[PDB]
Amino acid sequence: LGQPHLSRQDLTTLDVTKLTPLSHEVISRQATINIGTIGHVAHGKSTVVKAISGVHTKLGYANAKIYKLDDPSCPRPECYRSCGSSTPDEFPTDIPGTKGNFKLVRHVSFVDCPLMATMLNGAAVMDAALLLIAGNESCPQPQTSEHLAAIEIMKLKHILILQNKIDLVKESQAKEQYEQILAFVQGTVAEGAPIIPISAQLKYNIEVVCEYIVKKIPVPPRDFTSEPRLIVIRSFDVNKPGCEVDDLKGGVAGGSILKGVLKVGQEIEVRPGIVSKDSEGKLMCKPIFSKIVSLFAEHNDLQYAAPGGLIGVGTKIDPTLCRADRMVGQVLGAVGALPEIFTELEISYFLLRRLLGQKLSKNEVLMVNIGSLSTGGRVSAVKADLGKIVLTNPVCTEVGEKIALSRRVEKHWRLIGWGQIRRGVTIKPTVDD
Amino acid sequence: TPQAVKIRADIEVACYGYEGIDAVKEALRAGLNCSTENMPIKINLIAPPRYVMTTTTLERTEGLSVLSQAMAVIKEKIEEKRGVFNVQMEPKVVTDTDETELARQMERLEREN
Amino acid sequence: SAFLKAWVY
Ligand SMILES: Nc1nc2c(ncn2[C@@H]2O[C@H](COP(=O)(O)OP(=O)(O)NP(=O)(O)O)[C@@H](O)[C@H]2O)c(=O)[nH]1
């Protein structure tokens, strides 16, 4: 209710069968579709997002509303605009001589990164991407190619390609890059994708990016009907030192919902929850239980929250469990809905053929990304595209789900490849009735 | 008068099931109900699960007893509610030196968030 | 694709 210009969501009326990624109820307040920003260092990734949204934000999330002027007298592309998530769903036009209101068409979230790991393990569901390519450099730069291989792997079809920094670059040189791009995407999953020139710095042609975000990127399918699951990507203690007792507040779980809807006052559990070590060192896991106290997407309060965006969940849970991201890696959802808890995985796996900036061995050290959980893991057995891992920390996850693998190369972590889970070993949860 | 003395205990309070902080609130509120007209009690958070319990008294003995009683009330309630209690510091008199080591560590803990 | 296979095995 805290924002009276926006949709009055209501749990008495909510019909989850009737939700769509464009339902104004929802879109008024939260983003419903996620757009990754990918490229190379200094190619303007974060800066494009900052230009579209106004936001200044291991992953990072920024929502932006996208509007169309309801005037026939609009010259293209200036029919389109973008704004911060808290802005009203209609406003009168800026553009002189044009008449009527901008009206909200779409509300999107930009999933910015310093990225390959998160892409391959599906920790950040990207419904689409912006491939940024700086004109002042050639195509592809190393990360640019690496990212495009990552896109091919993730099978994301809908893409926009952004030639950035055109403020620095003369038209002759600008067009000289264009064929490099065209050739580089030819033979790849990006082959059909639009190329748009922009300046993130001077905010040239941003309207076009918005136009093509509305037009090229279709409404993705969603699972609103299942019981929900969220991945905890951040967790917070909101209580500032000095706190008096009545003013103590819950720990807050922040994540991207994958399915279902969270509702205020819904009862939830978290897996694996609290990890504890038995007499014989044997792992034992107690799921955390609680109640949703409140819901947020950025500065917008919600009574229900739906996949897309990063959604903040207020809870009863003692802050000691949420503080300084202690719950990151956990899965959150409705009671009895959550996946099984695993300590060992059999996986089918695939590696980077290029030694970018070789195959497995037994008892090899790995760090492994499953959902938001970077855990230590160690190899148990090996074949040419199949093997087995034992995990340092237990995880909550699904058979078939993607996971990503890193080795301590040059004495520090680099990704080497990925796999699907095909079988695994689970902990029985211990619940005190 | 033996000019009024400031007395403090550090207490660690927690709950890891359904009622979570609403249980912890209730405990610490029972704590506050142990305050006396001549001796109010104040609880303020340090950083979970640790909290600071303070009182002003004209005699050490009376204040140290009051806090040490309230500590028990609190322990009973959180333990009644599947939760946890620990004493990080049995109640001393607070030197304002000790109080600065607190106030500085509370700013440290703001920065750690 | 050959492009993917140049980067994967
Ligand atoms: N978009 C854009 N960025 C520019 C331009 N000229 C310089 N920059 C640099 O862009 C930076 C801001 O964003 P940038 O780092 O390029 O984005 P990024 O790709 O997200 N970097 P990272 O991969 O580290 O997140 C500034 O440090 C600035 O110096 C320009 O014309 N356009």
Numbering used by the authors:
A (entry chain A): 10 to 66, 80 to 136, 141 to 383, 396 to 471
B (entry chain B): 185 to 297
C (entry chain C): 426 to 434
Question: What did the study's authors say about this model?
Answer:
Dephosphorylation of eIF2P terminates the ISR. In mammals, two related regulatory subunits direct the catalytic subunit of protein phosphatase 1 (PP1) to eIF2P: PPP1R15B (CReP) is constitutively expressed, while PPP1R15A (GADD34) is an ISR target gene that is part of a negative feedback loop that quantitatively dominates rates of eIF2P dephosphorylation as cells recover from stress. eIF2, the physiological substrate of the PPP1R15-containing holophosphatases, is a bilobed trimer.
To test experimentally interactions between human eIF2γ and the repeats of PPP1R15A, we sought to crystallize a minimal complex containing eIF2γ and a single repeat. The PPP1R15A420-452 (R3) peptide and eIF2αγ dimer, purified separately and combined at 8:1 stoichiometry yielded diffracting crystals, and a structure of the complex was determined at 3.35 Å resolution. The interface between the eIF2γ and eIF2α-CTD was well resolved and consistent with previous published eIF2 complexes, whereas no density corresponding to the flexibly attached eIF2α-NTD was observed. Polder (omit) map unambiguously showed an electron density in the hydrophobic groove between the G-domain and domain 3 of eIF2γ. Residues 426SAFLKAWVY434 of the PPP1R15A420-452 peptide could be built into the density, with the conserved Phe and Trp facing the groove, a configuration in agreement with the AFM predicted model. The biochemical counterpart to this feature of PPP1R15A is an interaction between a shallow hydrophobic groove on the surface of eIF2γ and a repeated segment of PPP1R15A with helical propensity that projects two bulky hydrophobic residues on one side of the helix (Phe and Trp) into the groove. Our crystallographic data are limited to this helix-groove interaction, but MD simulation suggests that PPP1R15A’s affinity for eIF2γ may be buttressed by additional ionic interactions between conserved acidic residues in PPP1R15A and a basic patch adjacent to the hydrophobic groove in eIF2γ. Mutating the conserved Phe and Trp in PPP1R15A’s repeats compromises ISR suppression in cells and eIF2P dephosphorylation in vitro, suggesting that the contacts established on structural grounds are functionally important.
